[PDB]
Amino acid sequence: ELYAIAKELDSWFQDVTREKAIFEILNKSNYDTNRKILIAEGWIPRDELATLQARLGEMIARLGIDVPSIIQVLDTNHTPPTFHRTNKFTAGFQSICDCYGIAQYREINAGLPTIVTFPFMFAIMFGDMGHGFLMTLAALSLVLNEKKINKMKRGEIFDMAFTGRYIILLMGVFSMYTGFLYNDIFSKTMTIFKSGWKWPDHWKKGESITATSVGTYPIGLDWAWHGTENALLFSNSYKMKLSILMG
Amino acid sequence: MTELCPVYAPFFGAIGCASAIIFTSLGAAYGTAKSGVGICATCVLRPDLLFKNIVPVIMAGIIAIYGLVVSVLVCYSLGQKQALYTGFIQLGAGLSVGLSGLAAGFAIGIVGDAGVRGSSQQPRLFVGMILILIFAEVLGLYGLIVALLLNSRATQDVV
Amino acid sequence: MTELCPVYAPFFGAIGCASAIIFTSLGAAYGTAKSGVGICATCVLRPDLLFKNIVPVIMAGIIAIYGLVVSVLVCYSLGQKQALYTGFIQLGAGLSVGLSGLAAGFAIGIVGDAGVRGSSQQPRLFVGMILILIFAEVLGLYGLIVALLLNSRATQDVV
Amino acid sequence: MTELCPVYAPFFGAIGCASAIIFTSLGAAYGTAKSGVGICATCVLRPDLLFKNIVPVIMAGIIAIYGLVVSVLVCYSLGQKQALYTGFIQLGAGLSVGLSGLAAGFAIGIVGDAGVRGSSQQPRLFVGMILILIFAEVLGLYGLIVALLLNSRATQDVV
Amino acid sequence: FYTVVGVFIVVSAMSVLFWIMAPKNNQAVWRSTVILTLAMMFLMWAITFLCQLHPLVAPRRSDL
Amino acid sequence: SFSHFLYYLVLIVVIVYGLYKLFTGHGSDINFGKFLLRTSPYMWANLGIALCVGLSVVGAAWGIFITGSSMIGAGVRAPRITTKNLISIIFCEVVAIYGLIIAIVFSSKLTVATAENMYSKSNLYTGYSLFWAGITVGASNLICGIAVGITGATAAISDAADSALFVKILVIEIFGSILGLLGLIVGLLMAGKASEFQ
Amino acid sequence: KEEAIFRSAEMALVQFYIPQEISRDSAYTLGQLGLVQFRDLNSKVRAFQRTFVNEIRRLDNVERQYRYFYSLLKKHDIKLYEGDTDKYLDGSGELY
Amino acid sequence: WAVDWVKDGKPAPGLLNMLINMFLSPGTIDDELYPHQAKVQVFLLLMALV
Amino acid sequence: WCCTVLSAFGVVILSVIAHLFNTNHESFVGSINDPEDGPAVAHTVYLAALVYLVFFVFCGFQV
């Protein structure tokens, strides 16, 4: 009997959990025993009134209730809640944005600009190709297996990262960009693009050598700056100005 | 060993450049310690408010950011032949920013602990706590502005 | 450097400019931290009265304003070949504004938290709070005029 | 002994190298001590998250690694003929990293204690503990950045 | 040099093109996010190039 | 506190004096090395030999009462522990034995140098070696005496509980005494090579 | 033809003229849409004077028997065998 | 950045100098960015303060 | 378990820096302090790449 009941017990629990909420909700409806034609209110998305009315009518026809069901919109003097029909593409960004504070009744939800600004603000702070690439692979580990992870307990292995599959992906691709524009796979600078500063062709064994501005490096910080005694000063001035301008 | 450029000139420059990060780091550390105790106390009871309540520790990290910026800016003016004026000004700027950041760290930590405690119970004290932290942070901002002025003229037409 | 304008003359000016912002920052930080503890203790019962009981923290803000304005002006007064007299007087001005602001900040903090604690109960105590806050801020005000009038003579007819 | 390279120049560089490990070791010691006291005191009721709460001691070990790396590199900077200036910047780098690490270690200790106390009692506080420990670590990280930038600057254009 | 204005022209053209050819479903999110990606990418490239446009300092080292 | 304010006064006056000398340009006038060279090495050597035995005795006595007081307190309930724990006192005063031996081997070294002659490398090295070898041995002896006293007190308390607990805790005392042995060996190694005051 | 994340969506407060007899089905389905809240009403009185107390108590009792099943089942050497099927239907099921 | 400073001949202001220099007074100290560039900005400053 | 990603990275990144050594690239080799022998260190780093390839093959036991 235990083996027999175990098959339906798991489904029976999730079935029976419904009515608790059902009666807790219709509790707010104020269905007095003497009163008939129960009257109540609730918050809906305005663009879904027609579809909810259609579904209710379809159910009433299915339920055989001869009396028609009607619904009317009140004068919304009281402030209604704020909603955002976010998809899985941006639900993480929206939730992280609203962690600070829920939006005003109809204001411009800050989630939408943050969707991009937060990953790029992180990336302009992060920089490296290699670390960003490994963390982008880590993000792919949850993005690709999103179907599997959705039905497996987050626990302490992922925890808040359960929703972070797409956030980490976008900050990783922006880390890629910041690497292209800071020119450092991990720390080491790459040299695909055209040669930058041309330090003088004749050099002594240990002489101090300056460089010549023969041109401008097209994409990002000039690889010639690497290893130089003025590299820290140049890069720091550069990215002070970059930070303040972007800010 | 020039009269205006003595050999012991860069000692003050190095001391200022370091102190600009030591004192700011101490202020930031005290701030984040007090704020973190507050966060732990409020979140063992009210776990959901954690991420929302993390801001005071950020504003403690402000002091460390300011120390880093002033330290590197002072360092870029260092030089073996630097005059005594340059070392003097770098020392003064480093002490000014570092101790302003230390005061900012004390303020940040104390009010962060108090505000975290308060927001644990009452919901809309958080905005006031944030603005008080804003004033505590802008204190370090005044310190940084002073340090930037000194460093800006640290090598202004120096003989 | 001549003995009229010795090589070490900018040391006093730099340390004065630093100490001005340092001490005003410590005073303002203590005041804002302690009064903010008071605010956090009072608003859990009376959240609405935050926008009114906020004043002492702003007053510490004006103390910080005093510190920065004196510091920046007396900093503009620097120079490598500055006269010893200039350095001495500007050290005097910096220390004066800084420690006067520190005393004012202690007064603001203690008066502010005590007053906000009291005004949590009684509303009409608010005006007395504010009155005592001005009569304490006048300390930093006196420091402000003292430092400015020292700065005025810092280079007036100096050699 | 060159006028710019006195015989007592190695004092400052050597003392900087020493402090770079001394102060960070004191800070990491305090952090590990307080963190582990909290660990063993609060996980005794519920043990299974001992391995989870090990983390602040890992952060203190990172602080110790920070001191180790700065100390070994400033050792690499040491020499006999080094200029006084070089010794000054080695001293500055050592003090910067050491005292920033001491502040970071105080933060690690206090935050780790509070965090493990909360985490043993409530699980979701663990992530916030992680975040704060990261911040208390980036304090010493900023100190390391300052120190390494300094002791990189401590060798070029030196006569 | 100073072709940053022309690069601004081309990225603005791409932004307007994507503005008009928004994805059919869920248009607003693509609309805002892609154009702001493009603009912010252009700005950060603009600084990282304009810094090296006419630099005031030169790389200096004692290494081969 | 008044004492802390005294420390603050000392720090501020020494800092201001140093800054004054540096700015007047006599930073060399505060010549620590010249002070080291001109002071007689006899003073360093004798301060070292005095302080090694002095600190060894201080640590020995400190550990002696630290162990003994708790030993007597625990012996009240059960005097079974007195004789069997006296080994802790023995291992506490072997530290004083070490101090006495280092003092006598150091006193093997003092003598009169030929007036101002031989005020040079050999005798200077001997003087500083004796000074901080004595400080090493004495301070290490003091600290291991503190440690062995604490461990002996704990051993007394534990012995009051169970007999075998005393013998399992005596290893803590042995580990503490290893510190004193190490202090003796390092003092001997870093002091012996210096010759007498020729 | 629906809103997006541009701002807060167009809110609405519509009035539920629920027939008394069909109330349970209407509430069940309306909750199934996963689309509506319910404005807090008649909350001025204590929680143990509601008209719904008896069904709440019997269903909570039922949940307690179900928990007792689960506890004794975990005590025994057997586990669940139909978790996947039930969750999928109730997760994002249609109006049916 | 836009102006090639050394070829331009006129002095190149510091990396982050001009505004903090301006904090003092409308009497622009030296090293003007462009014709009246350091001069007309007093209009912006007075606009902000009023 | 975790060694798979380490092995894959030790293939890819270690191989690209290996070849970039063998290319006598300025940013990596030829400096006053780094070893002057490009292909010599290239040989041992290629051997490291190969042993990480074998290590990745071993870690591919996840199937």
Swiss-Prot record, chain E:
Keywords: Hydrogen ion transport, Ion transport, Membrane, Transmembrane, Transmembrane helix, Transport, Vacuole. One of its GO terms (molecular function) is ATPase-coupled ion transmembrane transporter activity. This is V-type proton ATPase subunit e. It is found in: Vacuole membrane. InterPro entries: ATPase_V0-cplx_e1/e2_su (IPR008389). The keyword Cell inner membrane does not apply. It is a multi-pass membrane protein. Its main location: membrane. GO terms for biological process: cell wall mannoprotein biosynthetic process; endosomal lumen acidification; Golgi lumen acidification; protein-containing complex assembly; proton transmembrane transport; transmembrane transport; vacuolar acidification. It comes from Saccharomyces cerevisiae (strain ATCC 204508 / S288c). Residues 22-32 are cytoplasmic. Subunit of the V0 complex of vacuolar(H+)-ATPase (V-ATPase), a multisubunit enzyme composed of a peripheral complex (V1) that hydrolyzes ATP and a membrane integral complex (V0) that translocates protons. V-ATPase is responsible for acidifying and maintaining the pH of intracellular compartments. Belongs to the V-ATPase e1/e2 subunit family. The keyword Translocase does not apply. The chain crosses the membrane at residues 1-21, 33-53. Residues 54-64 are lumenal.
Swiss-Prot record, chain F:
CDD domains: ATP-synt_Vo_c_ATP6F_rpt1, ATP-synt_Vo_c_ATP6F_rpt2. It is a multi-pass membrane protein. Coiled coil: none annotated. GO terms for cellular component: fungal-type vacuole membrane; Golgi membrane; membrane; proton-transporting V-type ATPase complex; vacuolar proton-transporting V-type ATPase complex; vacuolar proton-transporting V-type ATPase, V0 domain. The keyword Transmembrane helix applies. Residues 68-85, 151-168 are vacuolar. The record marks 93 as: Essential for proton translocation. The keyword Transport applies. GO terms for biological process: endosomal lumen acidification; Golgi lumen acidification; proton transmembrane transport; vacuolar acidification. Keywords: Hydrogen ion transport, Ion transport, Membrane, Transmembrane, Transmembrane helix, Transport, Vacuole. Its main location: membrane. One of its GO terms (molecular function) is proton-transporting ATPase activity, rotational mechanism. Residues 21-46, 107-129, 190-198 are cytoplasmic. The chain crosses the membrane at residues 1-20, 47-67, 86-106, 130-150, 169-189. PANTHER family: V-TYPE PROTON ATPASE PROTEOLIPID SUBUNIT. Belongs to the V-ATPase proteolipid subunit family. Proton-conducting pore forming subunit of the V0 complex of vacuolar(H+)-ATPase (V-ATPase), a multisubunit enzyme composed of a peripheral complex (V1) that hydrolyzes ATP and a membrane integral complex (V0) that translocates protons. V-ATPase is responsible for acidifying and maintaining the pH of intracellular compartments. This is V-type proton ATPase subunit c''. It comes from Saccharomyces cerevisiae (strain ATCC 204508 / S288c). The gene is VMA16.
UniProtKB/Swiss-Prot annotation, chain G:
Disulfide bonds: none annotated. Glycosylated. It is found in: Vacuole membrane. V-ATPase is a heteromultimeric enzyme composed of a peripheral catalytic V1 complex (components A to H) attached to an integral membrane V0 proton pore complex (components: a, c, c', c'', d, e, f and VOA1). Belongs to the V-ATPase 116 kDa subunit family. Subunit of the V0 complex of vacuolar(H+)-ATPase (V-ATPase), a multisubunit enzyme composed of a peripheral complex (V1) that hydrolyzes ATP and a membrane integral complex (V0) that translocates protons. V-ATPase is responsible for acidifying and maintaining the pH of intracellular compartments. Is present only in vacuolar V-ATPase complexes; enzymes containing this subunit have a 4-fold higher ratio of proton transport to ATP hydrolysis than complexes containing the Golgi/endosomal isoform and undergo reversible dissociation of V1 and V0 in response to glucose depletion. Present with 55714 molecules/cell in log phase SD medium. This is V-type proton ATPase subunit a, vacuolar isoform. It comes from Saccharomyces cerevisiae (strain ATCC 204508 / S288c) (Baker's yeast).
From Swiss-Prot, chain I:
It is a multi-pass membrane protein. The keyword DNA-binding does not apply. Keywords: Endoplasmic reticulum, Membrane, Transmembrane, Transmembrane helix, Vacuole. Residues 22-44 are cytoplasmic. It is found in: Endoplasmic reticulum membrane; Vacuole membrane. It comes from the Eukaryota. The chain crosses the membrane at residues 1-21, 45-63. One of its GO terms (cellular component) is fungal-type vacuole membrane. GO terms for molecular function: proton-transporting ATPase activity, rotational mechanism; RNA endonuclease activity. One of its GO terms (biological process) is endosomal lumen acidification. The keyword Hydrolase does not apply. Accessory component of the V0 complex of vacuolar(H+)-ATPase (V-ATPase), a multisubunit enzyme composed of a peripheral complex (V1) that hydrolyzes ATP and a membrane integral complex (V0) that translocates protons. V-ATPase is responsible for acidifying and maintaining the pH of intracellular compartments. V-ATPase is a heteromultimeric enzyme composed of a peripheral catalytic V1 complex (components A to H) attached to an integral membrane V0 proton pore complex (components: a, c, c', c'', d, e, f and VOA1). This is V-type proton ATPase subunit f. It comes from Saccharomyces cerevisiae (strain ATCC 204508 / S288c) (Baker's yeast). The chain holds residues 11 to 73 of 85 of the full protein.
